[PDB]
Structures are given as C-alpha cells and as structure tokens.
Design a binder for this molecule. Sequence first.
Ligand SMILES: O=C(O)[C@@H](CO)OP(=O)(O)O
Ligand SMILES: O=C(O)[C@@H](CO)OP(=O)(O)O
Ligand SMILES: [Mg+2]
Ligand SMILES: [Mg+2]
Ligand SMILES: [Mg+2]
Ligand SMILES: [Mg+2]
Lengths: 433, 432
Amino acid sequence: SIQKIWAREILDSRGNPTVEVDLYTAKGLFRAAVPSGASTGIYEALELRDGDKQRYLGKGVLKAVDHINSTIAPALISSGLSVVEQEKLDNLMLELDGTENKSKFGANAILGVSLAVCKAGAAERELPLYRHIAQLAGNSDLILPVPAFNVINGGSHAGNKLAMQEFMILPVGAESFRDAMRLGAEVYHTLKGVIKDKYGKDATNVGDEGGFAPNILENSEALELVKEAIDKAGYTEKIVIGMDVAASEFYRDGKYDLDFKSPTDPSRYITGDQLGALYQDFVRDYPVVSIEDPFDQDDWAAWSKFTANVGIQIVGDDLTVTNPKRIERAVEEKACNCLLLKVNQIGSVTEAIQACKLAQENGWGVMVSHRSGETEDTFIADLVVGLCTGQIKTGAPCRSERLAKYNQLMRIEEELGDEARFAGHNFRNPSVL
Amino acid sequence: SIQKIWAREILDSRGNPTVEVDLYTAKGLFRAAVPSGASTGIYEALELRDGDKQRYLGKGVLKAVDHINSTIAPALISSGLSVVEQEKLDNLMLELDGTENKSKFGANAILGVSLAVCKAGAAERELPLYRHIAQLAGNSDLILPVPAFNVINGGSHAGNKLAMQEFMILPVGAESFRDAMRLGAEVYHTLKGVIKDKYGKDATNVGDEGGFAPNILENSEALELVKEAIDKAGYTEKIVIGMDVAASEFYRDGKYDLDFKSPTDPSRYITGDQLGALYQDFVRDYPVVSIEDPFDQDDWAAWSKFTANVGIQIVGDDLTVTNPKRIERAVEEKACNCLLLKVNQIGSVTEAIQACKLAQENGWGVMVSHRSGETEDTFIADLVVGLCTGQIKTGAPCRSERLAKYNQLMRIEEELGDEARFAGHNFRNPSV
Ligand SMILES: O=C(O)[C@@H](CO)OP(=O)(O)O
Ligand SMILES: O=C(O)[C@@H](CO)OP(=O)(O)O
Ligand SMILES: [Mg+2]
Ligand SMILES: [Mg+2]
Ligand SMILES: [Mg+2]
Ligand SMILES: [Mg+2]
C-alpha cells in the first residue's frame, strides 16, 4: 500500500506553477506532474490556483499542494488499498472531494495523485506503465500511435495574428514510430527554411507548443506553408495535416472573429456557416484529415451540421472535455467523431480511461493530448500506447516538454520489439491491426 | 559492475538527434542524454554527427550510438570496474578513443556513457547524485546556486538582429533557491508585457533557450527592457544582470560585427577597444555583474586587458572550453576570472570535475551551464550542487528542457532541508 505522499509546486513549460506529487511504496518513489491549459474550455474540471497577487501573479498552487499533503495523503494511506487498485483509490478521492467539478481540492490536486498511484501500481504489478494501463483499460494488443506534430502555432499559443491555434503534421505513411519522428523532424526543419525564406528570420521563433510563430493572419497561408514543407522534404505521399481551430477562443456574440488578437471590430466577424464553408475549402485544397474544435463548445448545431457534411475526423476538445456526460450528448447528436483525451480536463486516470472506452465503444477515434502548459512528465506516452488509441498530439518536435513524450514513445517502441505495431493509416481505428 | 550498456538516438530540444545511454547494474537502470550547442567554440571536443544529408539533414548520431554499442559498452563491461570508479571508467574510454579531442568516438558518445556511469555510481554508494558528485570532487559543504535566467535571447541564431547572445537575470537577493525561481518567473512574465506593450505581440515569441526574441538591434535596448521589467516586478534591489556576448560568433577580420545577422558590411565593424568601452558603459548604466565571452576565443590580449580594468565577473566559455589546458593558459594570462562549465565541451565527467577544481584552486568562480540544445536530462542540477559552484545558467524559466533542471534544484533544496544554504550575494565566491 502507500507509505507516504508528498506534493510540491514545480514550474511548467510556460513558467507557471503546477502540482508535482511524490508517492512512496515499498517499491520506491513514483513521481508525476500535472499539465495546465491556456485555451481551457468552460466545462473543464476546476484547476485550483491560489489567487495571491503578490505570488506568481496569482498562479501559485500551494492550496492544491496542501490539500494533497494534509488531506488526501492520510486518506489514501488510511485506506490500506494496494496502488494497483486505481479505480478504488480514484473513487476515494472523488468522494472525498464530493463536488461534480473537483472544486474542493481542485482537479490538479486529485490528478497529481491519481497519476502517481498509477505509476506505483505498474511497479507493484512489475509491468511497464503502458502495460499496466492496458490492463486497467482491458486491452491486450498495444499499438504505437501516429504523432500529430503542431508545427505552426497561432491562437492563444503564439504572438501573431493567426487565429487558429494549431497546424499539425501526421506521418501516417511512416514505417514505425521512430520513422514518424524522423519525418516530423525533417519537415519541421524544412519548414523553418520555408518560413525564413519567405518572411525572414524573425518569423521563426516559436510559440508555446514549439511550432513556429510567423507573423501571418491567414489560416490558409499556414496550411500552404506546411504543405510546401511536406513537399520540399519529399514526403507528400506520407504526411497529412490536422488542425486544432480552438474556435471557443474566438467565438463572439454568436459569431467568429478570425482576427481576435487585433483590436475589437465586429464588422470582421463571420457566421458559423461561413466558417464551415472555409473548412470545406481547406479540406478540398490541402491534405487535411482532422479538425479539432471547429466551432464553439456550446455551438452544438454547427458541429452536427458540419460533421454530417464531411468524411474526415472531427475532434471534440472543449466540446467534450474528457467528460462522459458531454461525450454522451455528442454521441447522441453526432457532433463529432473523435475524442481528445486530456486527463486534466476531468481530473483522474480512472475517469479518463472511462471517457476513452466510451468513445471507442461508440465508434469514435481518440487522440491523447498534452496541454499547452506541460512538464517533463511523460505519462501520456504510456497512456496512448496502453489505451491503443492510435493517435497522440504532444507538440512540435521542439521544446523538451514535447520531446520528452516523443522520446518515451520511441523507447516504448524499442521495448515492444517485433511486437511493436504502428497505427499508420489506421490512426482513427487501429484495433484492426 | 556494469551489466549492460545500450545507447539510442533521441531528439533534443531543437528537434535534432542526440545520444541517450541506458546503463544497467544490479541497482537498476540509469539513463543520461547529451546536450548540443549552437554557438560552439572551435576548441570544443568533437561532436560526432553522421553527415548523411538525406537523414535529419545530416545531423544523425547513429555513428556515435554505434561506437557506444559496439565498442565502448563491451570494453567497460569486460573491465569489471564498479560504477563508483568514475575516473577509471572515463580513463578507459579516453584511451580507447585515443585522440586528444575525442574525434574517433565523438565526445557525445563518451559523455553519454560517463554521465550514466555517474548516476549508477551514486546508486551504488546509496547516495543522491549531488552527494556522489561532491565526494568525487572532494567537497563536503553543499550550496544551492543563484540561477541565471536567459530572458532575452539574441546572437548567431536568433530570429532577431540582436548580436549579443544572452541577457540574464540573477536573483542574488532571493531568500532561497525556490524563492529565486519565483523572482525569476515573475520578472519573466513582467518582461513579456513590457515587450508586448512596446513592440507588439509578435515580439513575444521565444528563442532556443526560452527567452524572448524581440525585434531589436541595440544591445543596450535589451538591457533597458530587462531593467524595466525587474523594476516593474518590484525587484530592483534583489536582481542583477549577466550577459553572454558570445563574441566569437561575430569576430570578423580582427574586429567585431555587432550586426552580424545582417548582410555583410565591413564598414560597421568595431575594434576590441570600442567593444570594451561599450561594456564599461553597460556596467556603469545597468546592474551588469557578469559578462561571458566578451571577446573572441583567440583574442587573448582583449580578455586580459579588459579583466584587469573591471571588477565584474568575466566568464570564459569558448575561451576555455571546459579544458584544463586552456584554463591553465587563461590563469597564467589573467584572461578571465570565472569558468563556464560545460561537460560536453570536454566530454567526460572526470575531466569536467578536474576543470572545475583547477578553476576553483586558482580563485576563479565557476558557472555550470546547459547548452542551447538540451534534453529532459537534469544531471547538471546535481552537478552544480555537488561542485558547490554557486551559480548555474540553464535557460529562461520557459521550455521544460530548462525547467527540468530548475525544478530538480528545488527538489535538491527541499531534500537538504535545514542544511540548505543559498549562495545569494556570494554567487561569485560561495566557499565563504
Ligand atoms: O486546445 C488544445 O488542444 C490544447 C492542446 O494544444 O491547448 P490548451 O492546452 O491550451 O487548451
Ligand atoms: O554559448 C553558451 O553559453 C550557450 C548557452 O546555453 O549556448 P550554446 O550551447 O549554443 O553554445
Ligand atoms: Mg484548448
Ligand atoms: Mg484543443
Ligand atoms: Mg556557445
Ligand atoms: Mg556562452
């Protein structure tokens, strides 16, 4: 069982405080940290910050840390449960918080412990994390996902006009995970040259997720730059494009502002229909195979309409918030066909796995995801392999809070051997391999 | 002894290949990875790259990985040496490579092994890494360093015109290491605003080390921006500035080009004398307490003359390349008074610790440093504490290949409990 739990405040990849947990068992020390979003959906579980203006501009997480150290710790220690008992230990924390959105302790408190317990449970089972996660989820046949690399950053993640948040490349045609890394990196480096040649060296600094942040406004131009880099790198047959629009960030009184980082001017706002029409142009002009949050998190009608009119992957993020309640509604309304899985949107390992299995039982894909604010933690690498989802997005191949996950996936591939299967073109539904 | 060594290619913080090593002993698995510079001194130990123009644009490290898996691993394993024997194991590597500059296996191959050996050594001693390193170095005091945060990035490779490489803030007046992290992070976020209000949001994206990359040319403007943010954040009395000029990057024809990322034009060149007068202006007008690589790695006369005429810290980086032979010369010529310690400029833990002790025995400071291409490895956090140097630069408080080290230092401070001391105002000479 659990011997000791100790939380502390560390800094995330943007320099903001976040929760880290050390959990001790007779097998040793297990450590996890909690990521943090910037474009956070209104329905996400509560991320509890201190609000002390003279400390980290109000962003401290000492209250969450104290909840773990003073309340959650003795409760789990008192339970005497084995760390393999992920569901029972998570349920104890949810019940002890007692609120629907984890607002007593914060989702960041509960999740930090939940992650560390799962790492400790793996060790107790004497299994790599990915395999323990597979067992928790009832899977046997592990798969390496296609990585989705966010190589141009916009929206709330970069200092440019570009309103859409992420432009991703997916090496579906790679021979292996390790090969997908090579394709992704090579295109990223080629892209830096494309941008520099066109816009100058000052357009080649990076946004919060490691993607370049060129000084452009038009989303189609970001698409054109990524397509050119794929082609110049020689991978047109093998790499396709995905997007995270993050439309909730630029939703304004029922309309959408594709220039939301410039001073307010409602005369430029477009309707949901016009935005849809734009995406139709993107899908026909570029190799876009996936679009995340194309509309606002409460714009259910636009989602459903759009999803019914395309053949590509449509990904719920702010829409679904890794929350079975909202997923059920989306499935009933056919609002989308893929769940973005963010453990910190719901606040526990057990509920994230439940959310994944719910989507998968309904024919949806699932893409495991980082947050904009990450840490050196690599749990989600193991998570996407154990959940067998076939897709992960965890940054450009730049900034080590992103590479740390991609390196871990390469290590997991190596460990699995000639039993490593890569999702490739089955990234939406890899259970067929 | 060592049961198995297995090296692999991973990606560093810029998305370029680098060497990782997994070493197994009865105590378990010990992993380390090797960083990589961009503004690399001509005298640095050789970083071996594959140069296959078709694969990772020539930057693969399959050769170095092969050297470790095929050549080095079986030799060290056959040796039977305990992983506690850092010196013997490094020396065996040095002799197998057989070249002064590690040009046969690559310094990246030998360091990857050397670091993993060290981590495994600590575990055999049943000590935390930082304590093992202290024992290797013969140190008993420990001290948390003042962090130097690179919050405005410039130089060879900066998506701006700014010629000088790094503008750093140092929270010398902090109450602890963890307090120094809050002061740094708050000034960083204050600086983002300062920049955004003056230059617009497009100037607030980041360079390789997580510092802002504003579209400016004048080095004094970088300093003004930094000074404003310190003051706006309310920390004028507790934070000071350090600079890495990396002047070898802009040395041209016996002179210096402060606009080197612009199309060539000799007319704009200045002499080392004009450059030194610029620095004396910076020191007088800004709270600059440390300047690294103010002159070219071969311009010994400028280094010695400037060091003799200032009371600030003068740091050799490309001048000394963590190399005891170069340090000897710099000591004799009084070229600088602080060593920048980069384990990968020399290629082994043993030799880095020898370089640090040579510097310290001659009354110099030592600043442990990252490279601009880093990994999720946090070795240098344990290093700077065990060597007791009192100062570390390992990035802005942004990008987790930087934060991973700073967060490890917070952990080490927490582990030392009541026995924790912070170098603070005594960063230059914390042995007092
Ligand atoms: O909207 C998103 O998918 C995420 C992931 O990049 O960004 P954030 O963590 O800021 O919500
Ligand atoms: O010159 C330096 O001190 C370093 C700073 O991290 O840069 P690089 O590793 O590129 O040489
Ligand atoms: Mg978001
Ligand atoms: Mg999103
Ligand atoms: Mg350099
Ligand atoms: Mg330097």
